[PDB]
């Protein structure tokens, strides 16, 4: 992936040239176009050049990250009009895109760890610099410390695996297997916190409500997918310890996602409800990963890609209504159909995508992740039916109470929808309904 990385490395000096924000967006969408034309990847590692290569898993993750970052520039126009350090913001986005491409193109696990910890810094910069509330300092510190406290012993695990095997390459590490409990806990707890388990989620709504949309989308669409891609790499050589210790994580991640789904029914903040919605569907992803079935891994990767697209799309809607109504809640934003009627179509087309939407990739990820949990045990049926029922109970309450009913009758005059916002909502929904025609690039990574 040297051409993409050098393209972005020479896209770096466009930040220092003024009035070039949309030019950087145009060339990043050109990168996404070229990366659409680079698809020839299969199971093993292809296009190998200077420790960089990808399989279908990493191809889909780089394509998702490139699509999210280009949309993020399109989403963040308030940086451009107020001139709120747009050069520093563009440089942060391009460097974070380099770090996410480099942690996804890693043939060895230590580049994945190194650029995975490097990607925490521009996200922390986005949190601490481009928010709007005094609790920015509470947000980036929770993100940084909840990531670092569990990601620091995983470095000791990495060096323990390296001494035992002698290499970090993902195929040479597939041959070995380990029967150590603490090695399993080090190599799992960092991904178990980085993608939120119910007991360790805390940092997620604090990082999401405070964060700017260009900063909430990179936490929702990706960077929870680092904690899924890490398990997709790690569980291959820790299968016996995973069969010893899966049931506690499956029980926690299936009780959460019901409790988490009951939380969203009793919350009024629009950005916090999508923040807890990221916990519940990747509770399904986390439950499907630790069952090592082939359908579990394939449907897990499908729901990672599709859930990233629909959660970033749902966080797109929560900032359009925020900048027009001054502050977001359920009470202020009640019934926006009479204010913005054309925005309501994307509101339902992306809130329905958060649950099982019929021609989207969210349903195809969800229909095959339920297969692994049902084939795992029949006890899990009771707490899956409640999970999906309460899932579409809360995610239809979002559209339901925000887009129907009487107006607030205390709001002032705001601007209407623009060409940028409808184009922004289109590129989150129509990829969810268009990649189902070639879902094997997002199902089969094996």
């Amino acid at each position: 992936m040297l051409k993409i990385i050098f393209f972005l490395l020479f896209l770096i000096p466009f930040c220092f040239i003024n009035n070039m924000y949309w030019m950087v967006q145009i060339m990043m969408f050109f990168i996404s176009f070229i990366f659409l034309l680079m698809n020839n990847f299969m199971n093993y590692w292809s296009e190998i050049s200077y420790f960089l290569g990808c399989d279908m898993l990493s191809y889909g993750l780089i394509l998702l990250s490139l699509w999210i970052c280009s949309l993020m520039l399109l989403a963040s126009e308030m940086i451009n009009k107020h001139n709120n350090y747009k050069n520093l913001f563009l440089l942060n986005i391009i460097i974070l895109l380099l770090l996410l491409i480099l942690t996804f193109s890693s043939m060895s696990l230590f580049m994945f760890y190194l650029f995975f910890e490097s990607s925490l810094i521009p996200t922390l910069f986005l949190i601490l610099g481009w928010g709007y509330q005094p609790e920015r300092l509470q947000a980036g510190l929770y993100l940084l410390f909840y990531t670092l406290l569990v990601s620091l012993p995983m470095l000791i695990g990495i060096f323990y695996v390296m001494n035992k095997i002698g290499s970090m390459n993902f195929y040479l590490m597939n041959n070995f297997m380990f029967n150590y409990d603490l090695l399993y806990f080090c190599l799992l707890c960092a991904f178990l916190v980085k993608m939120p388990m119910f007991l360790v989620h805390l940092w997620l709504p604090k990082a999401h409500v405070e964060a700017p949309v260009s900063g909430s989308m990179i936490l929702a669409g990706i960077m929870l997918k680092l904690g899924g891609y890490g398990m997709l790499r790690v569980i291959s050589f820790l299968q016996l310890m995973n069969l010893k210790y899966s049931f506690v994580w499956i029980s926690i991640s299936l009780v959460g996602g019901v409790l988490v789904s009951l939380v969203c029914l009793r919350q009024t903040d629009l950005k916090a409800l999508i923040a807890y919605s990221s916990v519940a569907h990747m509770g399904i992803v986390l439950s499907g990963l630790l069952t090592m079935t082939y359908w579990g891994l394939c449907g897990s990767y499908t729901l990672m890609i599709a859930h990233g697209l629909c959660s970033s799309g749902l966080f797109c809607l929560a900032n359009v209504s925020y900048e027009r109504l001054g502050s977001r809640s359920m009470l202020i934003n009640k019934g926006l159909l009479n204010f913005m009627p054309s925005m309501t179509l994307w509101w339902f087309l992306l809130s329905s995508a958060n649950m099982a939407a019929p021609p989207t990739l969210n349903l195809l990820g969800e229909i095959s992740l339920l297969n692994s949990i049902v084939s795992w045990s029949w006890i899990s049926m009771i707490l899956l039916s409640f999970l999906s029922f309460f899932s579409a109970a809360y995610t239809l309450y979002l559209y339901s109470f925000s887009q129907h009913g009487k107006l607030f009758s205390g709001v002032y005059s705001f601007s209407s929808g623009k060409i940028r916002e409808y184009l922004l909502m289109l590129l989150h929904w129509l990829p969810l309904n268009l990649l189902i025609l070639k879902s094997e690039s997002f199902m089969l990574w094996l």
């Binding site: 308030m78 107020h82 481009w130 928010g131 709007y132 509330q133 005094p134 920015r136």
Partner: peptide, 13 residues
């Protein structure tokens, strides 16, 4: 952009 460090944030140090 709406909130910036006020002197009340400056007071605790």
């Amino acid at each position: 952009a709406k909130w910036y460090p006020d002197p009340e944030f400056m007071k605790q140090f």
